[PDB]
Amino acid sequence: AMNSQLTLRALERGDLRFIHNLNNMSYWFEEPYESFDELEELYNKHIHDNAERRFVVEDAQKNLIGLVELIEINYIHRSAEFQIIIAPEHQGKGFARTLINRALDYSFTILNLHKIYLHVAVENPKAVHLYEECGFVEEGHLVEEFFINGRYQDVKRMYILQSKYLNRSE
Amino acid sequence: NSQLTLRALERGDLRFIHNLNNNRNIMSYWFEEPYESFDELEELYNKHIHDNAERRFVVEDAQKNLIGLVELIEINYIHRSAEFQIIIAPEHQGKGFARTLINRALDYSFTILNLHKIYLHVAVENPKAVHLYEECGFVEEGHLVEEFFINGRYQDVKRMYILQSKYLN
Amino acid sequence: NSQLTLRALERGDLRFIHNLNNNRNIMSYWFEEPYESFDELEELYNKHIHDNAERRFVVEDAQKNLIGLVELIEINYIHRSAEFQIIIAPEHQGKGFARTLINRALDYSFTILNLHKIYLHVAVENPKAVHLYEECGFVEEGHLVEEFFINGRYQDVKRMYILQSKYLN
Amino acid sequence: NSQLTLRALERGDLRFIHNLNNNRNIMSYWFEEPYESFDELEELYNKHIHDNAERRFVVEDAQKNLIGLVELIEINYIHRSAEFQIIIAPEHQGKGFARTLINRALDYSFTILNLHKIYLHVAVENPKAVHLYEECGFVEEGHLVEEFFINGRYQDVKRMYILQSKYLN
Amino acid sequence: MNSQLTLRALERGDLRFIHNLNNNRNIMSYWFEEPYESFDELEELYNKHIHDNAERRFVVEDAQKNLIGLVELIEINYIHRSAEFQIIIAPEHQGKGFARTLINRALDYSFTILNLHKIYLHVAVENPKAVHLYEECGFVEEGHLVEEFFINGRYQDVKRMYILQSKYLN
Amino acid sequence: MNSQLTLRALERGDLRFIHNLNNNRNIMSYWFEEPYESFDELEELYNKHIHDNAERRFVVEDAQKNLIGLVELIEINYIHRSAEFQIIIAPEHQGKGFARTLINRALDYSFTILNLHKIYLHVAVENPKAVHLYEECGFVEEGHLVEEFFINGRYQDVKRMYILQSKYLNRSE
Amino acid sequence: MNSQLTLRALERGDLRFIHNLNNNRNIMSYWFEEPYESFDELEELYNKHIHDNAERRFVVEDAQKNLIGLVELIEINYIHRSAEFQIIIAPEHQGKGFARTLINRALDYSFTILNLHKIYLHVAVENPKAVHLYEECGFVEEGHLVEEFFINGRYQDVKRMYILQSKYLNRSE
Amino acid sequence: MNSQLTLRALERGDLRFIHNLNNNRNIMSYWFEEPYESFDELEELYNKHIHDNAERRFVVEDAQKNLIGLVELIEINYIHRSAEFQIIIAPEHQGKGFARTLINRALDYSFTILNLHKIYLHVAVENPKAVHLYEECGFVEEGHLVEEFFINGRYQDVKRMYILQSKYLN
Amino acid sequence: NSQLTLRALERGDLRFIHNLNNNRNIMSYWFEEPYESFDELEELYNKHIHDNAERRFVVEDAQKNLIGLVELIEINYIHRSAEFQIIIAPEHQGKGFARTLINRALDYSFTILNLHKIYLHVAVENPKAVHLYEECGFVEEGHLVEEFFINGRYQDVKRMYILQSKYLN
Amino acid sequence: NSQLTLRALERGDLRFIHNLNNNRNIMSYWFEEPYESFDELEELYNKHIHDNAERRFVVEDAQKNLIGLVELIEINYIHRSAEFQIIIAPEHQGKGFARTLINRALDYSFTILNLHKIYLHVAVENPKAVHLYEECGFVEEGHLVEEFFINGRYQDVKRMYILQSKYLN
Amino acid sequence: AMNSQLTLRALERGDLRFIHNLNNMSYWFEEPYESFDELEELYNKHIHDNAERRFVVEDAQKNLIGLVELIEINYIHRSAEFQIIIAPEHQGKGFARTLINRALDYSFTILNLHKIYLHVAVENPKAVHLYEECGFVEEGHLVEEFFINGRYQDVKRMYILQSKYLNRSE
Amino acid sequence: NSQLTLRALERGDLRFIHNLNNNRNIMSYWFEEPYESFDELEELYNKHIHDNAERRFVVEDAQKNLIGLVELIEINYIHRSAEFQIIIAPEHQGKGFARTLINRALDYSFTILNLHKIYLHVAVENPKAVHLYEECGFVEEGHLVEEFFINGRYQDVKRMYILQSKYLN
Ligand SMILES: [Mn+2]
Ligand SMILES: [Mn+2]
Ligand SMILES: [Mn+2]
Ligand SMILES: [Mn+2]
Ligand SMILES: [Mn+2]
Ligand SMILES: [Mn+2]
To answer: Which residues bind acetyl-CoA per the record (chains B, C, D, I, J, L)?
Structure first.
């Protein structure tokens, strides 16, 4: 209900600590990093690169809630992959749908992308169902795609198109 | 209105420009490069300090409150033309400052930069703004079809111009 | 016409581009920066090699003769638009190539770059050119007043556009 | 087929890669950056020489004729996967080299790089290619909707994979 | 009042004052023949030309260190031994009789320290009182430049006036 | 003859010629307001100012590509829209009547391509023939600069002469 | 008094003082043969020449750390083993008898630490009191340079005075 | 012979000749007050000081382009308007009467082009014939520098001789 | 003596080093380059931070008072030798520290750096110092004639060495 | 012991690392480059930030006291091996933390980095350390003769290893 | 017998092709490379680095025979690892012992190292025996150290000391 | 002997210097940095072109054959001293050139550089060389014990000097 006070803002240098705290292997523009020091240098290097865009999510009190990321952005095919990360202490408060809507809205009314896709573990059917409710549809079931917790797991690939998100209600 | 001033934009004004871009909530550009992050804006600012293709001015009142921004872009010094954009901070909209800012901009453009022509774009769906520009002496020279993707759809804009010869009489 | 090809511009083609600019005898630009000397053109070329705001193609025949140039400029990948200019070498003007080149340019723009809109400027005093563009599907969206200083006086130009939806159907 | 060899790509092979890109006539990429001119390709090459994310092999015969190219991209060394593309030079298409190249690539991927999975994309509108990949042991894991803008329209592609366990048994 | 006016070499800390002088005057200002508007541009042009001898500047102060004005020598040529001189007095100090004193300080510097041969200046034809003041200080008209400067919405004529080292020293 | 004179933008390969022109004249030459003497200094000043718009130069060639002379615009200011012009003809081509043609080419460029408002030049007071030539091409004296230049052992006066875009373009209208 | 004068190598924090000394003297000052006027130019010339051995400078302080003056060696050549010396005392400390002491410190440094062979200086012909002071410290006139320097509106002559290491070190032996 | 001698600005292609002149002369040579020995060092000092105006050099050629000598102006000061002059004639061209002509060319350049006020030079006290030649060309002794230069195993005295622009021009 | 420690020199110690050089009143060197100003010393320090030809240590007591400096220079890792210099601050001279410092330096040189030989120079006119070095195991290997210009005249110095084999037994 | 944690090393930890190196009092290395001063360590740190060959973890308790350091060096990601060193701060030596740290390191090495082998070196003259490692599951694979010059003499060290298969069963 | 004509020379840029041909995963200063282009850049980067030293082996006719490498050189411990690689076409001609002697001689009479060690596959007992003949002694048997041909293999670590190689005959 | 000349070393002589180092077969240094590869020598050469601490001269005959090298190193311009080394190419040894080269070097050192003292090192085991130096006026000032590791063992060298005052009489 009280998701009204969540704001998105473009990621900046001061947010790197938070990003570092969030990851428990991460990448910055497809380059791996572990230390905050490496992340700092990778950040300076890619500041003008348009292949990935990030937004930190804050509440009215400026607490850092989570992160919205678009990666693999291609401006000819007009597509991007989307990932959302909510800080542990803010999980389970119902913010996810709101953040997903903000991300799609940005992608489809500002960047003018045509398609957005994402990956979700097959073993997290609750998350899969949440994405289906937000209008995503399964386009793939990737077999043994990611090595997580000691074994290769399958993931769903789900997408939504700009035409669908914008004209859903017409 | 009499106490509104223009001053050349400086690094310390960038936070304000960044705030104007967040509230406005469309993609903003610095020397034709889109920016989102304050850090990207700051780097684009340092890179183009010596570039004359765009010039910007902040608008302040007698008390130094930041009112808005005046921008000249696509400046070409052979054809002597430029595009003009004006942005008033939300809290200062509706107070009658617009005409004043437009006059300041034209005055600068035509009595200091010595430009020949100034043009601007205004949404077709904002006929009040179109009418305001017509009152300040601008005339429609084009109706650009599906020129800008704004708020989820391609929109048409009027292109309006005024010439130095007209303004200087 | 069937044997005309477009190929991405390369450093070795700059001599040709420079020759086209001399006979045309108007101020030429490379990424919105004016140039006159071959050396300035070469340096602007090296500087903008990775810049996606402009794309150029040389036109060749089956025998590799250099026919002309196709340029897309002001490319904006959010609004998905670009401005188009075409230049045919003097000795190849009047051979019927223009329509073919225009089609190749639109095809590239709309089936490879995935742009939404392409526009161009054409002198009002060249109504034959205007008519040719109308035949290829372009429509006037503006009549720009005293937009360009050409041959000693400010001239009006038509601004003409075509949309991807129209060209693809 | 027995006499086909793979060799790690070097700067001298860039001409060949550029030639392959012209015939295919869709936008090509070098480490996810698009390029059209040989000059752009050469610069992107110098820039990514130390980058592990993509690896390429040129295919030659006993006489050193250039047959084609094998590319692994989006290589991830933790998940141990990569995307595979194969490009055969026009003059060598239809001669039965494809299956051999595919086998060489899988062998390399699975017995030398020690990858776990190899996947590829194939246009839904090219069912003969899809069928060939199914014969080589690939299986469909996705049907990507309107994934790529190719020839004026968004097209669907199949995503097909093969696992190291399957190929090695 | 006038005996206590001093010239001192312009320094980085004075640029704010120079910027304020440019805002009040409200015509396009130049630094090493490059126009500037923003304080940032002025500061970068200042850093870039610190070792360039084609222009030299001095701030004018009183006994209490109030900033009175600026003296500039530009187009300095050390073979022909000439330079252009410009003087700008802050609004609040105009009309107080400082000008003649500043002009003499500038000529003294030019002719007894830099060893220049000639100093010239430009003065609007529409400011005959200024022209006459320069004539009183020993300058003579050598040209009447037609529509030389676009100032305040129109091309204006300016007098070009000069004085020679031999005249000022004898 | 004069119909066949062409202007082209100066390029690096023309610098030898420019250097030769400077040696014959035998007075101090400048490139972007910096004096130069050696070819090497000229070449480095050329590389340094390639993208600087305050000066523009053109070499003059005939139908056979012989190098005839040089046209320079300096002190170009794009707000006031003015520039200084200098023309130099190679010794062996002086006295063939090319000057007026080159002056027309320069004015035409300045006023129909760069869109400048005013062009001025300096001419030695002791070269009244040159002053007269400039007056015929439409220039008018706007100053007589006293002891402006140290040339050949003494300070000399020069005329400053100008012409406006309105006059050159619309004289006939 | 003079026993308590110390020399120390010039440092960045002393540049304000050097700048103040230049303003009072009111003639053109140089740093590594480059003239400077603003503090900012002096600071950049200082940063640029930090590792340049052609000039060396020392500030003079008293027991209380007040800044008294400056000792400079310039044109140092380590093959010919010579250098030019200049000494500048702050106005408020002139006339207290410090000069001879500073000159001795400078000679001592030059001849017992740098191992130079010769030290020379310039003194205005119109400052015969200074010339006499230098003669007392062991310097001898080796030239009377005619119209060498343009100072205060006219070319002035200066004496050039020198002293050799052998004389300063072994005079007493 | 002498009417056909020309001065031209030194260029990179002349450095081999300058290096040969330094080897034959067999004393330590300087470029912008820095000693050089190797051609490589000379070439780097040349590149580094191309835009430095404190020294200017000219090679002397005959009608057939044979390299005759070198004319150098050093310690050029554009406020006091003075410079030091050095002339070096290639061994095979010494004794042919070129010197006076070269000296006049150098003074002419200095005084009718650079607009200098004074030119001075150094000449070994042990070469009174050279001293006398300079006196004939209008130079006057202004100093006798004691043990100024360590040359050929010993400190040597040199005369310092000067000439003024007013004298040479009148 | 037991409470004297050696620690690797750091930027914050440069003031102390500079103070030692002023009272000693002879030309000092940093990596064979002479210095006088603190600023020159600081720049030489930044430049040679990774240079292994010289190593320095400050000597402190239990209370962290700065006692002196130990320097190894001309370090050659093939011949395995180095030159040693030791400087004790004026106020700490005559307290018996010298022998202790010499032992610490040799210990470092021979048990950590693994050098084979350490040598030093000592003025012939300081026979007390020479005798102290002989007591610590050094032996004269040369009497260098007029090696150093010090206090207005060329002075002879003894060169004294000790070998790792001797110190370790 | 239960409350000991490992945390990836950062720039702010360099002081601590430098303190550990002073107490050990033998030559220390950062990516195989020796260092003594904090300044050298800081420069070597900046230089190797992107280098994968060594990884470090600081050990803290619940209250954030700095206990020690765990280092993996000579990491090879193909052969999947690394050399391990552990350093405990003097004040925490002898309190029983060692075995716990060793277990944490093996666990990390074998369940997170997926290494195959971990080896270490231990002085032959420190048989209690050797015995402790044998108890933790390491086995001698070499006795390296006169491998390290430590405290004035070349000393032998045991090389001890443990394999992932052994630790995980 | 005719090993007398083998020469060692320090590796230089032109030898990189040969080094590239020799490797069938290699490293340059412990940094991995595959392409010749990467090797070129790594070469430029480490030219002044003393941690590794390489020598190419040539015959009288300048054929490239092989490579001698010292790596992990530490100048405090005074040790290094040695590797020798003979080009396929030159294997089996008896050159190895000669190259090993050249390497030890260099290491022990020029670099002044104290110890040299090497690694040899346990499954290549012929090579192990050759090294024992040249004076090396086993100091370790590394268990499952290297993944070669589809499985982890054991390797011997063998060393020789300077004192032994130099005084063997006394 | 009369026709032997010195000339300042230049880049084109480096191959010769490299050849001299290969035949001599001991570790060579350039500005105290050891070099082996021609590429390392070339980079050290470019780096120290402006460094005055060492000066070198090649020796040529009338026919331009390269005879040898004269080097002054450790040049100090305050103490006015330098170390001298001379190397004659193998094929030119034994022809009586040595005395001549020594005289050329001393002459340069003492009549051009104005040095005060020149010293050199000569193996104790080469008494013929020692005697030659004594004949040219040098005197032993030291017998350095185990100073250089040459040919597998530490060797002693004589240090010999001569002063400018002596040579200039
Ligand atoms: Mn990707
Ligand atoms: Mn634009
Ligand atoms: Mn100017
Ligand atoms: Mn000087
Ligand atoms: Mn290692
Ligand atoms: Mn040394």
So the answer is: 86-88, 93-99, 126-135
Does the distance separating the beta carbons of K51 and J117 come in below 8 Å? Answer: no
CA distance G119 to G83: 5
Q: Which domains does chain D have, with CATH numbers?
A: 1-169 (3.40.630.30)
- CA atoms within 13 Å, Cβ hemisphere of L15: 2
Contact J156, J147 (CB under 8 A): yes
Phi, psi of A167 (to 5 degrees): -110, 10
Give residue H72's identity as a one-letter amino acid code: E
D88-93: long-range contacts at Cβ-Cβ below 8 A with a sequence spacing of 24 or more? D89/D19, D89/D20, D89/D23, D90/D23, D92/D67, D92/D68
- Technique that determined the structure: X-ray
D167 is catalytic: no
Q: Which helix (H) or strand (E) holds G142?
A: strand G140-151
**Residues E150, B114 contacting (CB under 8 angstroms):** yes
Among the partner residues C78, C112, C114, nearest to A111 by beta-carbon distance: C78
Q: Are strands K115-121 and K79-86 parallel, antiparallel or unpaired?
A: parallel
Which helix or strand (DSSP H or E) is residue J118 part of? strand J117-123
Give every CB contact of residue C74 below 8 A, 6+ residues apart in sequence.
C53, C54, C81, C82, C83
Q: What ligand has the least distance to the C-alpha of A29?
A: 1
The three-state secondary structure class of G3 is coil
Resolution to 1 decimal place, in Å:
2.4
Q: Are E55 and E32 in contact (CB under 8 A)?
A: yes
Nearest alpha-carbon partner for G105 in G159, G153, G58: G58
How far the first Cα of chain B sits from its last, in Å, is: 22
Cα D40 to averaged position of ligand 1 atoms, centre (Å): 19
The tokens 């252009």 sit on which residue?
Answer: E84
CB distance F12 to C38 below 8 Å? no
User: Which amino acid, residue L136?
Assistant: C
In K, minimum Cα distance to I110 occurs at K76
- Write the residue in E79, E113, E114 that is nearest to H115 by C-beta: E79
Residues 6 or more apart in contact with residue A54 via CB below 8 angstroms? A10, A11, A67, A68, A69, A70
Q: Largest Cα–Cα distance of chain A, in whole Å?
A: 49
Please state whether beta strands G82-89 and G118-124 pair in parallel, antiparallel, or not at all (unpaired). Answer: parallel
Query: What gap in Å lies between CA A103 and CA A98, rounded to an integer?
Result: 9
CB atoms within 10 A of CB E12: 14
Q: What angle do CA G27, G33, G37 make, to 5 degrees?
A: 40
Phi, psi of K125 (to 5 degrees): -65, -20
For tokens 């070190």, the residue is G169
Residue of F nearest to H47 (CA): F40
Query: What distance in Å separates the CA atoms of residue B134 and residue F98, rounded to the nearest whole number?
Result: 53
Buried b (16+ CB within 10 A) or exposed e, G135-172: eeebbeebbebbbbbbbeeebbebbbbbbbbeebbeee
D153 reaches C (C-beta below 8 A): yes
Q: Which residues in chain K are closer than 8 Å to D55, comparing Cβ atoms?
A: 34
Query: CA neighbours within 13 Å on the CB side: how many for L144?
Result: 22
Please name which of B149, B6, B137, B147 lies closest in space to residue B67, comparing C-alpha atoms.
Answer: B6
DSSP E strand stretches across D9-54: 28-30, 33-35
Angle made by CA atoms B2, B7, B8, in degrees to the nearest 5: 155
The residues of K assigned a catalytic role are: 131
The pairing of strands G6-9 and F140-151 is: unpaired
- Catalytic member of I35, I45, I133, I161: I133
By Cβ distance, the residue of J78, J143, J161 closest to K139 is J143
Contact flag I77-K77 (C-beta cutoff 8 Å): no
